[PDB]
């Protein structure tokens, strides 16, 4: 029972014209001349008449234009589907005069879902056929429907004239034009389109309900991609630029002022492609000034929305004119529930991006595991419940907004729906809650001030902004410029710019530190090479800028971005963890971060793209009161190391090499050589080799100890090479002492199967070690779901009653025919009976599964909820029923945040490490 259906039926039994009160027939009432039927039946015919009767009423009630008698024409021929179809071009309005002159196609709000080739099915394509068979002058074509829009129930129709495009192929090349929006009385309407004036009349058609997303997605892919010579990605980027231009057009325009995202059919002639390109490029070249935050006039003027020779103009016209009739800003309504253009874009991304190897994405399971392992939902709830504020998640590597969109959906689904119980209404907290979450049509409005990102790639930055806007948000916070630049470069032309401030830090190289964000989720590039000039321009803001390991620079940027006490989650490769060369970066991490978790991801996460092993790293940036302690310890155990080095060098020089005694060595060195004092020298030689000595060496002679441990004394007697941060001390000795004094437990785990196995031929489910799904949803409306079962019950019972109807019809025909037709009647009756046993073997199983489902709800779900002993969903019996049967339709694609026991890596991470 659809939304429009109830109101339209109510007006069918409350007609102001009295034409639809008599059911199953209208031959005895006025305005019911439709040449009966030609194939089968003249009775109730579905949704068609349901809205066409109200259309007739509106024609007679308010449109008037004299009553006449509504004398229409006859039915033409269409070869649609099985057998030729003889339609009466839906409903007709007097055909104006004797010949066909006016064509109307009544559709339904739910009928926009199943079929989209009927926009012109009884329109233009067959309009020429009518003009070629009966020699008529059809001019006006209506795609009529009225959904629910207040008392006025305004028609959200697509009304077109038949004077602009001689054929329907050229009309489709004209991108589904519309020369009318609302039906006009007195036989009026403008000849050309009424354009897209954004106040009234056409508006912007902001009610995207369902499945027209899929219709457009199939239409765009089958036309734009096409074939020829291209490489998918640039076509995708061109489409992204077109969408960006449409978004800019919606931003800049005000009341009236039409819209530049049109075709401008002057009179009857279609636009020349050149002028349309100029208009769209002016839209795009001004989008960069306002959205992409670019200031170079030369760059912003020497470019274009499409590359022309790699993007034909006909495709441009088709795209620019088909993409309208739906707002890319507020159009998301999904009938009731919003968030409908996002799924459109990920449908576009999935079908045509061609990930290849250079531009791949972190898989969604990995992103969700990173977000949950940081307890992002808990942090957001605590920040909102105490500071009346939300975290400041950033992504210096960004990409397609993969780490940002997931965080967006996470916060919205965890603070509003799933865990709003944790939020306690305390007036000002409630004020913020309604300020940022409650408006459902703008639910993703909080993240206009919190989400940030930096993508170096121009096309990737634009695509990320488009993804960000389609879900609905201020994508202006994503910078399409580099992520390793001083904070002054990130200039946002509106709102507070948290990524703009900078200040030198005392105990960090006297270099700039933002220190404003809380969570930094990112996947740094595996091997970035930079370049000469770029490297020279950046080796002043980072301690290790001289070293050509620019991949490690991101961790330093992560420290520069995180505030004291922030959380860091990354996908760093194994080279950070194992390779000897990257020793300095580990010391930097240990100095400025409290390492709190590390997960060794398997070698299959990025399997189709790259086989490089990666290990997730989690850390919490240390406060200054602990960095000062680290610095004090690093000197207390540095001076001792230097003194020990001097003493051991003197001992090796004298005892082993036999060098002559020099009084200038040291007052403690030349104080016991004459007196022997082996134990005092023994303590020094043991302490210098803090982890090399063995108990068996406690008895060897002094000369033998320095000889046995030679080739290793020198190794532990070297400074940290080119590094002014660690000082002129062997870090390994000093770090070994500091870690002994400053010791804390650290989580450690590995995963052998993430859950997916992607390949060049798709992907396939695999066992998951990171997390566990929910399957059985937390809250399921028992009345709604049982109503769905009852709907399927009575849908099948309708077929049962129909079959009983033929059984009753044929049970009287046995006596009517003696032998010849009697044999055929008996055979038909026998196969009808066989269908009856088939349908009853369906029905008994249907009833049994209704009973078992009702048992499942009573024994598990209690009342529209889930019992506390099953909330953990650890029972195998509860899970598998949703995995099979019809319950699989509902399910729940949410990660199970179990905190009672441990069964997956994510479970003990949330129950183990404590973030302070």
């Amino acid at each position: 029972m659809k939304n429009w259906q109830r109101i339209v039926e109510a007006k069918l039994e409350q007609q102001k014209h009295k034409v639809a009160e008599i059911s199953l027939e209208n031959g005895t009432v006025n305005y019911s001349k439709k040449i009966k039927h030609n194939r089968n039946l003249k009775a109730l015919t579905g949704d068609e008449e349901i809205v066409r009767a109200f259309l007739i009423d509106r024609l007679v009630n308010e449109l008037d234009y004299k009553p006449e008698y509504l004398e229409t024409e006859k039915e033409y021929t269409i070869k649609g589907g099985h057998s030729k179809i003889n339609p009466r071009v839906d409903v007709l309005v007097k055909d104006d005069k004797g010949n066909p002159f006016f064509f109307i196609e009544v559709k339904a709000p739910n009928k926009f879902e199943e079929d989209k080739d009927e926009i012109e099915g009884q329109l233009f394509a067959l309009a020429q056929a009518e003009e070629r068979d009966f020699k008529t002058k059809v001019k006006y074509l209506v795609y009529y429907t009225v959904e629910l829009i207040d008392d006025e129930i305004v028609d959200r129709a697509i009304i077109i004239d038949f004077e602009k495009y001689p054929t329907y192929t050229d009309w489709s090349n004209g991108g589904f034009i519309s020369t009318g929006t609302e039906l006009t009385a007195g036989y009026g309407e403008p000849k050309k389109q009424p354009l897209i004036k954004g106040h009234e009349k056409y508006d912007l058609r902001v009610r995207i309900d369902r499945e027209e997303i899929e219709g457009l997605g199939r239409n765009l892919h089958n036309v734009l991609w096409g074939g020829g010579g291209t490489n998918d990605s640039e076509i995708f980027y061109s489409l992204v630029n077109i969408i960006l231009a449409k978004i800019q057009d919606e931003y800049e325009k005000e009341d009236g002022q039409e819209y530049d995202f049109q075709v401008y059919q002057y009179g009857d002639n279609v636009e020349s492609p050149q002028k349309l390109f100029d208009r769209i490029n002016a839209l795009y070249k001004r989008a960069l000034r306002e959205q992409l935050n670019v200031t170079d006039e030369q760059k912003i003027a020497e470019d274009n929305v499409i590359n022309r020779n790699k993007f034909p103009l006909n495709k441009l016209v088709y795209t620019v004119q088909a993409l309208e009739s739906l707002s890319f800003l507020e159009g998301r309504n999904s009938l009731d529930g919003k968030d409908i253009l996002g799924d459109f874009f990920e449908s576009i991304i999935r079908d045509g991006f061609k990930q290849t190897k250079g531009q791949f994405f972190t898989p969604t399971p990995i992103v969700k595991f990173i977000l949950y392992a940081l307890q992002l939902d808990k942090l957001a709830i605590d920040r909102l419940n105490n500071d009346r504020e939300l975290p400041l998640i950033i992504d210096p590597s960004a990409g397609s907004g993969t780490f940002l969109i997931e965080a967006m959906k996470l916060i919205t689904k965890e603070v509003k729906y799933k865990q709003n119980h944790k939020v306690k209404s305390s007036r000002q907290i409630t004020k913020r809650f309604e300020e940022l979450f409650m408006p459902d049509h703008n639910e993703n409005k909080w993240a206009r001030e919190y989400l940030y990102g930096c993508e170096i790639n121009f096309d990737l930055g634009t695509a990320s902004k488009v993804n960000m806007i389609l879900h609905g948000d201020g994508s202006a916070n994503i910078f399409v410029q580099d992520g390793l630049l001083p904070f002054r470069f990130y200039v946002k032309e509106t709102s507070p710019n948290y990524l703009e401030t900078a200040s030198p830090d005392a105990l960090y190289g006297d270099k700039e530190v933002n220190g404003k964000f809380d969570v930094v989720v990112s996947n740094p590039p595996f091997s970035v090479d930079l370049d000469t000039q770029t490297q020279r321009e950046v080796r002043n803001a980072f301690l290790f800028g001289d070293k050509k390991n620019s991949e490690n620079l991101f961790i330093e940027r992560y420290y520069q971005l995180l505030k004291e006490g922030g959380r860091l989650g990354v996908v760093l490769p194994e080279s950070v963890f194992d390779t000897t060369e990257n020793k300095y970066i580990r010391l930097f991490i240990f100095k400025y971060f409290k390492v709190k978790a590390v997960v060794s991801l398997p070698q299959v996460t990025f399997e189709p793209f790259t086989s490089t092993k990666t290990s997730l790293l989690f850390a919490q940036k240390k406060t200054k009161e602990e960095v000062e302690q680290w610095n004090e310890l690093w000197d207390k155990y540095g001076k001792e190391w230097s003194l020990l080095k001097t003493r051991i060098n003197d001992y090796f020089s004298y005892f082993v090499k036999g060098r002559p005694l020099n009084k200038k060595w040291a007052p403690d060195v030349v104080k016991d050589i004459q007196e022997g004092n082996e134990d005092n020298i023994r303590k020094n030689i043991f302490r210098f080799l803090k982890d090399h000595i063995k108990e068996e060496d406690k008895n060897l002679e002094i000369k033998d100890l320095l000889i046995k441990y030679a080739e290793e004394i020198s190794s532990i007697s070297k400074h940290e090479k080119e590094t002014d941060v660690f000082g002129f001390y062997n870090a390994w000795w000093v770090f070994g002492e500091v870690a002994k004094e400053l010791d804390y437990p650290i989580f450690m785990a590995e995963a052998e199967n993430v859950g997916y196995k992607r390949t060049k031929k798709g992907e396939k489910p695999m066992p998951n070690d990171l997390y566990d799904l929910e399957y059985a949803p937390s809250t399921l409306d028992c009345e709604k779901v049982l109503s769905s079962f009852d709907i399927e019950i009575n849908a099948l019972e309708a077929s049962k009653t129909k079959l009983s109807v033929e059984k009753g019809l044929l049970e009287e025909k046995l006596k009517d025919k003696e032998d010849k037709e009697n044999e055929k009647i008996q055979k038909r009756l026998n196969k009808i009976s066989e269908l009856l046993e088939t349908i009853e073997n369906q029905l008994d199983s249907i009833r049994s599964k209704k009973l078992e489902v009702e048992g499942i709800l009573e024994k598990y779900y209690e009342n529209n909820k889930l019992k506390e002993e099953y909330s953990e969903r650890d029972d195998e019996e509860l899970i598998n029923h949703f995995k099979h049967g019809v319950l699989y339709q509902y399910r729940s694609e949410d990660i199970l945040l179990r905190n009672k026991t441990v069964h997956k890596i994510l479970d003990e991470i949330r129950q183990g490490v404590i973030w302070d």
């Binding site: 194992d578 580990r586 437990p745 450690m748 785990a749 890596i905």
Partner: protein
């Protein structure tokens, strides 16, 4: 996966302050009085030997060394330096060569888990140079004891210090110098010597004697099939090397039925004409075929939970299905029974390399469980009065079926050349009487059974050679 918990101080174990999961899976507080590298062995720096040119030296990479510590060197000589082996000489000239001093041990640095450790024995002659990818150690203790203690034991501590780093899991001399060998494990082995060397020497010489008579599973089939039919195997390999066929236009439709004129077909014709010059027992196979049912290949996960599925690696030159399933599905097709292997079925491989396509085998193994054969298997229920399926499979595995399917396998991708039912129906193979077919089957069944028994004794000896070491160490 594993869930452990370590402390900050444990990061000080190595001067490289690594904190990867694999390294610290082994890191734990120790109570045993561990030995170190100083007491046991000594790393010998590698040097470039001055190779002579007249004498043909022998070189060996990592790939030439086997898992069980055997070397299969390549005989190179500067006198004949062609382009095929030019890369090896390039490595030699660059300086990736060293001559191991006698008694040392050479541990491979790349991928330690393969346990590719080789020992240069103190005896014997013809020393062989090695690639610098190995690591030299001079065992101060008895060399054989350390060798066996490193292969069998300590195979996981060596694998616990390998560094992957965006690529190859490799070792370093420092990694070996960091190892923490135990005392009781090594002192038990060292003290109980003078018999733990004699027993192992006797077992190793027995294994060597067993290997001395080993033959491949293809030569045996080739030998007997060459014994019959009086086929000159030397001349067949010479005519196969010809790369020039000049056929006419008229001889393109002869028995073609689909107009194939590729070079492979025209050389198939020549080879098949040569093969049957003296044999007169040939009839087309298409007469004696009743069905050509294919298999089913659903999406399968390695070691999954469901019905097992065979693979193209389970067909051997013997002619028996290996019945060693690895992949498992959980999908159904409403017709599961028709795609289950049964005893006596004849399966031919469909889709492999140019040399491994068409391998056939009879199940000959009573297994009560159901195992799916993939759509790369063609099952060939045939007339069991003239063919004697085992004979057909072992003919197909022989050079009489390894040359036809090498030149009839259609396909654009030469890596997955495939055979269709038409090739099976149009294959002219020699059919001797039923009594004559049985004689060959007995021969290349008894010989291969003896060979397999040889393959089993060597494995048992190589297993007890480490069981002895384990029981000696832990005692």
């Amino acid at each position: 996966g594993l869930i452990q918990r370590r402390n900050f101080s444990t990061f000080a174990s190595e001067p490289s302050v690594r904190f990867d999961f694999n390294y610290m899976k082994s890191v734990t507080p120790t109570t045993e009085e561990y030995y170190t590298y100083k007491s046991l062995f000594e790393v010998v720096p590698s040097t470039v030997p001055t190779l002579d040119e007249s004498e043909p030296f022998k070189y060996a990479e990592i790939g030439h060394v086997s898992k069980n510590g055997e070397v299969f060197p390549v005989t190179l000589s500067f006198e004949d330096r062609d382009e095929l082996n030019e890369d090896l000489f390039k490595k030699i000239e660059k300086g990736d060569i060293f001559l191991p001093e006698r008694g040392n041990i050479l541990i491979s640095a790349i991928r330690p888990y393969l346990n590719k450790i080789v020992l240069i024995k103190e005896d014997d002659k013809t020393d062989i140079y090695f690639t610098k990818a190995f690591i030299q150690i001079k065992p101060l203790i008895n060399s054989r004891i350390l060798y066996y203690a490193l292969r069998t034991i300590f195979s996981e501590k060596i694998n616990a210090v390998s560094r992957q780093g965006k690529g190859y899991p490799t070792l370093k001399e420092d990694d070996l110098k960091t190892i923490q060998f135990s005392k009781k494990v090594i002192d038990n082995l060292l003290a109980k010597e003078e018999e733990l060397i004699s027993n192992i020497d006797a077992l190793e010489k027995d294994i060597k004697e067993l290997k001395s008579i080993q033959r491949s599973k293809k030569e045996i089939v080739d030998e007997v099939f060459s014994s019959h039919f009086n086929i000159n195997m030397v001349e067949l390999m010479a005519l196969d090397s010809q790369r020039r066929v000049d056929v006419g236009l008229s001889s393109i439709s002869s028995l073609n039925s689909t107009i194939r004129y590729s070079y492979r077909w025209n050389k198939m014709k020549l080879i098949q004409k040569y093969l049957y010059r003296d044999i007169d027992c040939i009839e087309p196979l298409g007469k004696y075929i009743l069905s050509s049912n294919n298999g089913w290949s659903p999406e399968s996960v390695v070691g999954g939970e469901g019905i097992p599925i065979l693979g193209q690696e389970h067909l051997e030159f013997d002619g028996v299905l290996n019945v060693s399933p690895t992949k498992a599905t959980t999908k159904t097709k409403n017709n599961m029974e028709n795609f289950f292997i049964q005893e006596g079925d004849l399966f031919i491989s469909r889709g492999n390399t140019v040399d491994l396509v068409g391998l056939a085998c009879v199940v000959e193994t009573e297994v009560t469980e159901d195992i799916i054969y993939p759509d790369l298997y063609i099952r060939l229920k045939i007339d069991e009065k003239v063919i004697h399926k085992k004979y057909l499979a072992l003919l197909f595995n022989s050079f009489f079926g390894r040359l036809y399917f090498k030149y009839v396998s259609k396909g654009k991708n030469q890596t997955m050349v495939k055979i269709s039912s038409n090739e099976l129906l149009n294959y002219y193979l020699p059919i001797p009487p039923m009594e004559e077919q049985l004689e060959i089957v007995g021969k290349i069944e008894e010989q291969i059974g003896a060979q397999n028994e040889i393959e089993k004794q060597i494995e048992e000896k190589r297993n007890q050679i480490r069981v002895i070491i384990e029981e000696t160490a832990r005692s």
